[PDB]
Amino acid sequence: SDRVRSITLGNSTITTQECANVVVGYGVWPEYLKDNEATAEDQPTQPDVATCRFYTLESVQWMKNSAGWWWKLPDALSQMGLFGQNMQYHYLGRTGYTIHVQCNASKFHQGCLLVVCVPEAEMGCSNLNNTPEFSELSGGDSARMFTDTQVGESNAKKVQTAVWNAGMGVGVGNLTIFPHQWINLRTNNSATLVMPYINSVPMDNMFRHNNLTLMIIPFVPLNYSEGSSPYVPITVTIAPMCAEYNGLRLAS
Amino acid sequence: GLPVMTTPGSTQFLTSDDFQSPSAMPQFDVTPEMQIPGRVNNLMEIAEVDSVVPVNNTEDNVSSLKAYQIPVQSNSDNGKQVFGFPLQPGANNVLNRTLLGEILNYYTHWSGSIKLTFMFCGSAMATGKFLLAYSPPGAGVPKNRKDAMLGTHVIWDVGLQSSCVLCVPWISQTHYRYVVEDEYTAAGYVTCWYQTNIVVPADVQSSCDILCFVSACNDFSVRMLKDTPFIRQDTFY
């Protein structure tokens, strides 16, 4: 059967009984840093069972006329376990992830989600002169919602969150060039994505630079007849892979 | 004192030239290369991925996510029409802005086949068959199911495998076709009709939606790189 997976990382395990395939990045599996491309000159810390495991983020409700969500994945993990304690005592660090969005419904519901993973998603502000503040770009493991109307220019520092432009200025239909999967409630129940380290420097700081973005956008909205269960939640389960850090200092 | 003789074309600045030129920083040392994932070697790798097509514009949906969804009901008659658009991937406003039309509008000629993947985004107990036709030009639009069955078609049954792929072939007199609208090199029409109904059980919603994707086959090609009309400037930024 091509419909069952079993992923094992560290001391955790994800079981699935109704899935699609597994989309692997840009054809690349995450590996450690080689000796050709390294630029730092002291021995890195590789915990590799303390950090590489499945951290489960918070749940969000899929309402009947909803818009979308985004987590800012690089430091979505910042307050989770021993991934968030090496992120502070160190200066550098590289990672790759294994994102597993899971949302289930019966055989009488209908809908469709798009689960992308957008590297370097620079967001636009509502007021044209300013740039959005930190609290509006990323919430610490809490989803930030899109809006099916548009945000006016009276708001000084807020992200422009119209869904049909995806907040970056591009069309929302063309987001299928990034590695992506659909959660069609007719056939699918979850979506797996294995992302390598995509950046222009061999190691980057973990608090000033969010090098991904995970967006869930419902292209076909939820619907059900009167009687079915109206609360359909969505859970994201992110796990780092082949994590290493460098340059120890005080706590920040 | 070698005798030379300067031809026409001397001391001109052509923007698409290929010459050498003295370096402004001698004996520089570049920063060594790194294996960043996801390298583009050719622009026809970008125009061979699927992108969602706004088949449902109608002036109220283009400022929404409703523009991508094609509405499909449960009817009381047979042979109705679901959608229809002409196959002009550079000038028709349906395929104007997808990932294929944003690349063809940099070039002038194009040649090849085009895939069209539909996906039934409905309930798990809804059934039905659709006919996906494509009629080459010469006559008008097909207006019946009898007039559209005579072209190129494929009858799609909705089951466990949700999606079905209509592959529009390359039938043309010339070796290329213009990106801009021209009636000398028109390409045809793509329609879609109910074969049978959409039959649902009790307590299942009847209004189901259908998405549509577009891409290019392994023999698509472009020519004569030009400028794009989808951008505009007044002063500097």
Epitope: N65, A67 | S64
Partner: antibody, heavy 124, light 107 residues
């Protein structure tokens, strides 16, 4: 049937505050956008701001002239909607309405279908 | 974006066909222009949404049209029931501006 009754208007001094309240009945309060429109005596209608539904996150969006002085919010338990007015001037004497919005197709056209009866504020 | 309605006051006898307008300074989308009717001393009411679609319970005599920056409302037969003031609404950017008003005076 939709039934919107608002209350809380009256005489007030310039430089003072006043809180209007609009109560909703007949529909689910967490599904629809809720607007606030005022109208001076025999003049044009003026839009003050709305407050989005639960699925878009209850954010607000004010006008250009009342931004920072007025505040739109609701109560968590029962179906009611507020408006807190601050630093009132002489031109704020008008009739204040409480309008509803809805989705017509699947999208959101910006109409205001069901209106309230209108409360009055006189500032002098 | 300021809406300008013309005429400010108008008069028509029952049985006539009368047409008012609402012209914007910049182009609005056709799905964002709406028409309202406020009678004398009462709360307003939605009349036409998205420039050609009739609201609920409205008579079939009213019909709006137009596109671009010129929009219009057309009454085929005037009765004594529709003597009121008609506003037009828009949206191109925030805020949503209402029109001045066209008062229908019965003859």
């Amino acid at each position: 049937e939709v039934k919107l009754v608002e209350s809380g208007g009256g005489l007030v001094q310039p430089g003072g505050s006043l809180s209007l309240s609009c109560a909703a009945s007949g529909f689910t309060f967490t599904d629809y956008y809720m607007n606030w429109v005022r109208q001076p005596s025999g003049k044009a209608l003026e839009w003050l701001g709305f407050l989005r539904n639960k699925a878009n996150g209850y954010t607000t969006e004010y006008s250009a002239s009342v931004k920072g002085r007025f505040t739109i919010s609701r109560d968590n338990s029962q179906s009611i909607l507020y408006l807190q007015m601050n630093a009132l001037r002489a031109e704020d004497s008008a009739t204040y309405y409480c309008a509803r919005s809805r989705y017509y197709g699947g999208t959101y056209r910006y109409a205001l279908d069901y209106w309230g009866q209108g409360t009055s504020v006189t500032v002098s | 974006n300021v809406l300008t309605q013309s005429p400010p006051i108008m008069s028509a006898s029952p049985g006539e066909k009368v047409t008012m307008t609402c012209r914007a300074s910049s182009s609005v989308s056709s799905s964002y222009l709406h028409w309202y009717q406020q009678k004398s001393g009462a709360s307003p009411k939605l009349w036409i949404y998205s420039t050609s679609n009739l609201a609920s319970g409205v008579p079939a005599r009213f019909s709006g049209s137009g596109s671009g920056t010129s929009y219009s409302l057309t009454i085929s037969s005037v009765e004594a029931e529709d003597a009121a003031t008609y506003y037009c609404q828009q949206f191109s950017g925030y805020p949503l501006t209402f029109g001045a008003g066209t008062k229908l005076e019965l003859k």
